[PDB]
Ligand binder design. Structure first.
Ligand code: HEM
Ligand code: CAM
Ligand code: CYN
Ligand code: K
Length: 405
């Protein structure tokens, strides 16, 4: 239901947006969040949904808030409060100065130099998945590619068996888009239950995989603790299993619906990187936030110590103040402004991996299956949460229009 309005919040600022089930969800998840940017809606509103919390609705305030870690702390970054309180992943639950030492370690496992180590495997897996599908003339995109492609790359990098994917993917989904079977804290404890013996094993007998690297790592010249190792590795599983998986489906849904845009990339494949950036703006999908460390007046609004504020990464690039005609996809857009990978000191470490996976998917799919569409009569359903997503994506094509490479 709606939580009682706290005394410090003016009634004129209330807008009861539900981030886990927004009212306009049938029109598409980005469209549903974009209701927060309609002419009647203030820059900063309070929703009584999900325990009650602020929402910044415009890219200027979202950016400003992500920059100001002094007032807007990452200690409690998820809504609802019980999720944000339980949330203890590293580095994401930490503020500078303490956060930074852990970033460098995490960067060692998921950063640009590891994208180079994985380059050929990424390329090979994309091609082999797509070639297997190509003659079928149809697929369920979410299960047949969007999941297996980034997840199998992640499980390889982490040296975890592919048979563990259904369990880990269930747990990860409960943290970002819960179905009600588990609280965030239960899902977290089950993820840690999984990781504890693995971290033990790999500190005793280190391998080359990402878990071994983290668990035997140093932070600013000193040994990482077992606890600390567990809390990153937890973060890495979540990051490996959810965002790219969902983003791929938004992108491919759009391409299936937009022959002109597919055409553009088939005829001008050099535009694929710019196209990746524009889709990252248009189909942005993350929304977490921060907790107020003290009473603070922010843009004429009185925020109180301990208030949660949702700072939707998704909204900055959709803000017409940042990008003209923001719901239009324009691969030639001159300045693509977005905060899809976050903003400030927690800027996504995985972004170089993500872009590689997106760019590879677009190139290799369009090479083999240039001409495809949504299955006739299918209605595509989205789901909203910390990371929003696509429930299912049935595609079809004529195998006669495809090319085995
Ligand atoms: C399209 C795909 C992706 C999107 C949209 C995305 C988005 C984000 C966002 C918005 C944050 C910041 C959260 C905050 O400020 O509270 C973040 C942090 C992070 N991401 Fe990603 N991400 C993607 C892919 C990945 C991948 C594939 C990995 C793993 C290889 C990854 C690893 C991380 C890590 C380790 C952090 C934490 C950095 C820190 O807290 O200092 N991300 N991501
Ligand atoms: C909000 C995020 C995208 C960011 C990386 C994974 C994620 C789900 C987090 O818990 C922090
Ligand atoms: C990041 N996910
Ligand atoms: K916490």
């Amino acid at each position: 239901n709606l939580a009682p309005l706290p005394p410090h919040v003016p009634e004129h600022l209330v807008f009861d947006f539900d981030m886990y089930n927004p009212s306009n969800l049938s029109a598409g998840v980005q469209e549903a969040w974009a209701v927060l940017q309609e002419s009647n809606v203030p820059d900063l509103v309070w929703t009584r949904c999900n325990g009650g919390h602020w929402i910044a609705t415009r890219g200027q305030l979202i950016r400003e808030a992500y920059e100001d870690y002094r007032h807007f702390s990452s200690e409690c970054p998820f809504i609802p409060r019980e999720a944000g309180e339980a949330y203890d992943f590293i580095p994401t639950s930490m503020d500078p100065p303490e956060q930074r030492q852990f970033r460098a370690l995490a960067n060692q496992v998921v950063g640009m130099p590891v994208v180079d180590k994985l380059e050929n495997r990424i390329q090979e897996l994309a091609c082999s998945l797509i070639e297997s599908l190509r003659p079928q003339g149809q697929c369920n995109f979410t299960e047949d590619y969007a999941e297996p492609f980034p997840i199998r790359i992640f499980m390889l990098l982490a040296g975890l068996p592919e048979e563990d994917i259904p369990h880990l993917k269930y747990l990860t989904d409960q943290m970002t888009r819960p179905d009600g079977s588990m609280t965030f804290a239960e899902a977290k404890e089950a993820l840690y239950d999984y990781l504890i013996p693995i971290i033990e094993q790999r500190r005793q007998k280190p391998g080359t995989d990402a878990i071994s690297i983290v668990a035997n790592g140093q932070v600013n010249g000193r040994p990482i603790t077992s606890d600390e190792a567990k809390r990153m590795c937890g973060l890495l599983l979540v990051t490996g299993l959810d965002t790219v998986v969902n983003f791929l489906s938004f992108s491919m849904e759009f391409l299936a619906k937009s022959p002109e845009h597919r055409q553009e990339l088939i005829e001008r494949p050099e535009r694929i990187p710019a196209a990746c950036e524009e889709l990252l703006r248009r189909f942005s999908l993350v929304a977490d936030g921060r907790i107020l460390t003290s009473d603070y007046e922010f843009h004429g609004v009185q925020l109180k110590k301990g208030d949660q504020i949702l700072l939707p990464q998704m909204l900055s690039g959709l803000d017409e103040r940042e990008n003209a005609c923001p719901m239009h996809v324009d691969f030639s857009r001159q300045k693509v402004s977005h905060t899809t990978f976050g903003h400030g000191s927690h800027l996504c470490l995985g972004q170089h991996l993500a872009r590689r996976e997106i760019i590879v998917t677009l190139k290799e799919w369009l090479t083999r299956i240039p001409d495809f569409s949504i299955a006739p009569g299918a209605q595509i359903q989205h789901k909203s949460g910390i990371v929003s997503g696509v429930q299912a994506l049935p595609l079809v094509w004529d195998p006669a229009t495809t090319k085995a490479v």
